[PDB]
Amino acid sequence: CGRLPDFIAKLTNNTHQHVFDDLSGSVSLSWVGDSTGVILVLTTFQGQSKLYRSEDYGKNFKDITNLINNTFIRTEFGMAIGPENSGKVILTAEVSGGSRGGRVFRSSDFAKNFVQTDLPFHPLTQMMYSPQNSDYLLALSTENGLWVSKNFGEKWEEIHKAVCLAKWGPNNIIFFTTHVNGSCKADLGALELWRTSDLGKTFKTIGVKIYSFGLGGRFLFASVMADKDTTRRIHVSTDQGDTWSMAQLPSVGQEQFYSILAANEDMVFMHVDEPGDTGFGTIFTSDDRGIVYSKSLDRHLYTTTGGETDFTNVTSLRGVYITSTLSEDNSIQSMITFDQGGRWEHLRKPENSKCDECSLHIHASYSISQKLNVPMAPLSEPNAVGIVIAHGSVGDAISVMVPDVYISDDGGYSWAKMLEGPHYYTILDSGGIIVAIEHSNRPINVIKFSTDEGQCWQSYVFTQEPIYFTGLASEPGARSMNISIWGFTESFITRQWVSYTVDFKDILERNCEEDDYTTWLAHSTDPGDYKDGCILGYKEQFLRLRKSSVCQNGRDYVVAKQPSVCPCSLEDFLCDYRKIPGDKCQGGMN
Ligand SMILES: *[C@@H]1O[C@H](CO)[C@@H](O[C@@H]2O[C@H](CO)[C@@H](O)[C@H](O)[C@H]2NC(C)=O)[C@H](O)[C@H]1NC(C)=O
Ligand SMILES: *[C@@H]1O[C@H](CO)[C@@H](O[C@@H]2O[C@H](CO)[C@@H](O)[C@H](O)[C@H]2NC(C)=O)[C@H](O)[C@H]1NC(C)=O
Ligand SMILES: *[C@@H]1O[C@H](CO)[C@@H](O)[C@H](O)[C@H]1NC(C)=O
Ligand SMILES: [Ca+2]
Ligand SMILES: [Ca+2]
Numbered sequence: 001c002g003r004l005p006d007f008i009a010k011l012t013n014n015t016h017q018h019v020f021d022d023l024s025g026s027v028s029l030s031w032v033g034d035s036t037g038v039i040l041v042l043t044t045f046q047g048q049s050k051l052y053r054s055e056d057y058g059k060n061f062k063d064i065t066n067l068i069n070n071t072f073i074r075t076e077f078g079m080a081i082g083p084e085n086s087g088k089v090i091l092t093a094e095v096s097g098g099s100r101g102g103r104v105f106r107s108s109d110f111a112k113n114f115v116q117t118d119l120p121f122h123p124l125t126q127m128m129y130s131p132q133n134s135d136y137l138l139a140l141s142t143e144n145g146l147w148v149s150k151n152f153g154e155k156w157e158e159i160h161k162a163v164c165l166a167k168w169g170p171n172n173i174i175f176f177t178t179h180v181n182g183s184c185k186a187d188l189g190a191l192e193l194w195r196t197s198d199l200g201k202t203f204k205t206i207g208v209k210i211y212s213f214g215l216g217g218r219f220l221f222a223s224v225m226a227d228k229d230t231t232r233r234i235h236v237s238t239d240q241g242d243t244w245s246m247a248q249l250p251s252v253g254q255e256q257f258y259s260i261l262a263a264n265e266d267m268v269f270m271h272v273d274e275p276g277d278t279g280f281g282t283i284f285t286s287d288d289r290g291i292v293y294s295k296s297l298d299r300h301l302y303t304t305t306g307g308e309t310d311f312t313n314v315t316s317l318r319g320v321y322i323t324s325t326l327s328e329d330n331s332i333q334s335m336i337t338f339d340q341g342g343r344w345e346h347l348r349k350p351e352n353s354k355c356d357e358c359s360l361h362i363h364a365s366y367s368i369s370q371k372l373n374v375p376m377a378p379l380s381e382p383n384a385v386g387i388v389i390a391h392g393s394v395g396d397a398i399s400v401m402v403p404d405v406y407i408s409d410d411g412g413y414s415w416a417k418m419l420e421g422p423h424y425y426t427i428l429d430s431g432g433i434i435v436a437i438e439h440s441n442r443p444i445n446v447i448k449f450s451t452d453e454g455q456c457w458q459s460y461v462f463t464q465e466p467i468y469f470t471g472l473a474s475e476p477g478a479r480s481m482n483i484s485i486w487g488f489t490e491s492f493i494t495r496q497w498v499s500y501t502v503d504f505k506d507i508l509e510r511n512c513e514e515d516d517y518t519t520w521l522a523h524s525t526d527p528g529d530y531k532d533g534c535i536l537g538y539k540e541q542f543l544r545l546r547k548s549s550v551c552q553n554g555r556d557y558v559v560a561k562q563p564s565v566c567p568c569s570l571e572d573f574l575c576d577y578r579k580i581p582g583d584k585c586q587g588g589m590n
C-alpha cells in the first residue's frame with residue numbers, strides 16, 4: 001500500500017480545538033439544518049445547564065446560556081429540532097413547584113434568538129412537529145391532555161383529555177389513543193383510537209379494544225384485543241383508519257409483542273415475538289397493502305418488549321438488511337438478505353481471516369447492550385454506495401473476543417478486515433473519506449483516515465494533549481468534510497470536555513471529475529446468468545468513485561445510477577399470486 005504524501009501539513013492548520021471547561025457530567029449534541037454548520041451543545045450537571053452554539057461545523061462554539069436566562073433544561077425532553085432547514089429548536093425548562101404550567105425556550109432562526117414561553121400545561125412528552133407544517137406542534141400534558149399549537153408553540157389549546165399516545169399522520173392528521181374509565185396502563189387493551197383531521201375541531205373514532213397503534217410507511221397499524229380472550233391481533237389501514245383489514249399475522253398473548261422493524265412506501269418488516277421469555281421471534285414481510293405477510297426469518301433475536309434487536313438496514317445498497325438470529329444452541333449468528341427478506345444467508349468470511357469453514361458475524365445493539373468491547377453498531381450511508389462498516393467476529397457465532405472492524409464495498413457480498421482493534425468510524429463526503437478512532441480505555445490522540453474506501457490508512461496526531469475519547473460528530477447525510485473528535489481531560493475532581501474538529505478540505509483539494517468515476521453493476525454475482533444483478537425485478541448500474549481517485553465528491557453530490565428492468569420470474573411473486581412490493585419486473589413469466 002502506497003500512502004499519499006504530506007498529509008500532516010494539510011491537517012495541522014485544519015485542526016480546531018474547543019474546550020468546554022464547565023463542571024457538567026453529561027453532554028448532548030444536536031445539528032440544526034443542512035448546509036448550515038449549526039450545532040447546539042447542551043451540558044448538564046445534576047442542577048445547572050449550559051448552552052453552546054457553533055455555526056462552523058463545530059470548529060468554534062459560543063456560550064449562549066444567557067439566551068435561556070440560565071434556566072435549567074430538562075434533558076428528558078431533549079432538543080426538539082424542527083425538520084429540514086426550518087431552523088426550529090425547542091428546549092424544555094424546569095419550573096418551581098407552584099407554577100401553573102411549564103416553560104419552553106423556542107427558536108425559529110437556528111438558535112440565534114430564543115423566546116421564553118410559559119405554557120398552560122406541564123409537558124409530559126417532547127413537542128412533536130407535524131411533517132406537513134413545522135409550525136404545528138402537539139404534546140401530552142402531565143394530566144394526559146392532548147395539546148396542539150398552530151404557531152410554533154406560542155399558543156396552545158387542549159383538544160382532548162385522557163390521551164395515552166398521540167402521533168402526527170400525513171396532512172396534519174393526528175392519531176391518538178384515549179381511555180374512558182381508568183388510566184392508560186390499566187385500560188391497556190380497552191383504549192379507543194381517535195383521529196382528527198382539523199386539529200381537534202372534529203373527531204372520528206377509528207378503533208376500539210385498542211392495545212396500541214403505530215405508523216410505518218403508508219400503513220397505520222393497531223393491535224386489537226379479542227372479544228372473549230386476552231390475545232390480540234394486528235389490523236392495518238391505508239386510508240387513515242376509515243377502513244381496516246385484519247393482518248394475515250398470528251395473534252399473540254399478553255406476554256408477547258409486535259414490533260415494526262422497518263417500513264417504507266412499499267412494505268413493512270414485522271417482528272412477531274414468540275411465546276415465552278426466550279428472546280426471539282419471527283420476521284414477516286408484508287405486501288404493498290400491509291395485509292399479506294410471508295415468513296421471512298425464523299428465530300430472530302429480539303430480547304424483550306422494549307429490548308434489543310440487531311436488525312440493520314444496509315442503506316448503502318437497495319434491498320440489503322443484516323440482523324442476528326438465535327441458533328438452536330442459543331448462540332448468535334448474523335444473517336444477511338439482499339432481496340428485501342426473500343432469502344437470508346450467512347455473511348461471507350473474508351478470504352484472509354481465519355476461524356476462531358465459517359462465516360462473518362456482526363456486532364450491533366445487542367452486543368453493545370451486553371457490554372462487549374464494541375463502540376459502534378454497523379454504519380452505512382445511501383450516498384456512499386456499497387460501503388458497510390462493522391465490528392465483527394469470524395467464526396461460528398458472535399464472540400466476546402476483541403473484535404476487528406470489517407468493511408464491505410459491495411453491500412455485504414464480500415468482506416475484508418478494515419482495522420485490527422475496535423474503532424469508532426464515520427463516513428465523510430459520500431465515501432470520499434473514512435475516518436476511525438481507536439477504542440481504548442487509555443487516552444488517545446490519533447485519528448485514522450482513508451481515501452480509498454478503507455484499503456489504505458494514514459494516522460494523524462491531532463493533539464499533543466491526549467483525551468479520553470467519547471464519540472464522533474459529523475453533519476448528518478455524510479456530505480461534509482468536517483469531523484468532530486469528542487473527549488475529555490480528567491483531573492482529581494472534574495472532567496474537562498473538549499472537541500477537535502478536523503477539516504479535510506486540503507486532503508481532498510480537487511473536486512472529482514467525470515473521469516474519477518467508473519460504472520459498477522450492483523448485486524453482481526455471476527455475469528454468465530441472464531438475470532445477474534436483478535433484485536426485485538430490475539438491476540442498477542452506478543457510477544462509483546475510483547478508490548485511487550483522491551478528490552471531493554461535493555456537498556451537492558448525487559449518486560448517478562441507471563436501472564434496467566429484468567424479466568419476471570417466479571422469484572418476483574408472493575402468495576396472495578401477487579408481485580412482491582417494490583418489484584418492477586416486466587415480461588418474462590407469470
Ligand atoms: C432502508 O434504507 C434505504 C435507504 O435509506 C431506504 O430507501 C429509501 O426509501 C425512502 C422512503 O421510502 C425514500 O426516502 C428514499 O428515496 C429511498 N432511498 C434510497 C437510496 O433508496 C429503505 O426504504 C429502507 N428500508 C425500509 C424497509 O425502510
Ligand atoms: C465544513 O465546515 C466549514 C466551515 O468551518 C464549511 O465551510 C463554509 O462554506 C460554505 C459554502 O462554501 C459557506 O456556507 C460557509 O460560509 C462556510 N463556513 C464558514 C463559517 O466558513 C465547509 O463547507 C464544511 N465542509 C463540508 C464539505 O461540508
Ligand atoms: C431571568 O432570571 C432571573 C433570575 O433567575 C429572574 O429574576 C428573571 O425574572 C428571569 N426572567 C424571566 C423569567 O423572563
Ligand atoms: Ca417472547
Ligand atoms: Ca477516493
